[PDB]
Amino acid sequence: DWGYDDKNGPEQWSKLYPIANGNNQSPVDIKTSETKHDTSLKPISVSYNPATAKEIINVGHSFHVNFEDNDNRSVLKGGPFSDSYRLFQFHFHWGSTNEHGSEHTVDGVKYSAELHVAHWNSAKYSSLAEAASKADGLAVIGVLMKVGEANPKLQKVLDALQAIKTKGKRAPFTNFDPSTLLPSSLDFWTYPGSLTHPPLYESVTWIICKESISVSSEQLAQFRSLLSNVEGDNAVPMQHNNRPTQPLKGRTVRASF
């Protein structure tokens, strides 16, 4: 299959997934001198119901927190969108050291981690599986995480990790509103892009917050403590899971501010 190590990592993904060399690949470096302000961009509005939080899962290369997505209890609206988008999961990316780990970069600056909050177009489509490969099917909020003070909002997520230490492990994760993880200012950049790992579908409208959130060095250690192996095998920590930034290929990054 695919991964983040030497033989199966980002540099080699194009062999199984040709779209990796596509025209709408993510993530990107946001150059602030080259962004175009857009007055038509409405403010981002998120309205999430904590009752939709369902489950936390170790997926080998990462972990996901999944949400019930059968109705519109948890929605994203506004920004560049006419359609309402339904929350389905959030997850993080991180790096081997504090010096890197984010996927998106801003004026060449790499952050320590990045939060992704993913949604699918339920106005246009009937399911995530239908939406996933569509140009307007997915919307992901990206939040850059800067190493510094411990983030108490992250704690419930971090506390849950001891129950899903190895690949394939899953556990209930309930009564959680992930808008509590977002920065106070929702000023954003947006561009048309892709999933940042296989299958790399060019189906994502990216919403990148200009304001970062904090994470401590020890909080990052907890991410890196997660194991990629199945229970009983020799422990293989998830050291990193961030893709290198990709060519803009003439796309414009728009700013709401």
Ligand SMILES: NS(=O)(=O)c1ccc(C(=O)N2CCN[C@H](Cc3ccccc3)C2)cc1
């Ligand atoms: N980093 S990112 O771009 O924000 C990103 C967005 C969505 C997903 C995701 O939900 N999955 C991808 C892996 N297989 C699963 C099923 C799946 C496959 C394809 C599309 C959606 C979901 C779940 C992963 C990464």
Ligand SMILES: [Zn+2]
């Ligand atoms: Zn992601």
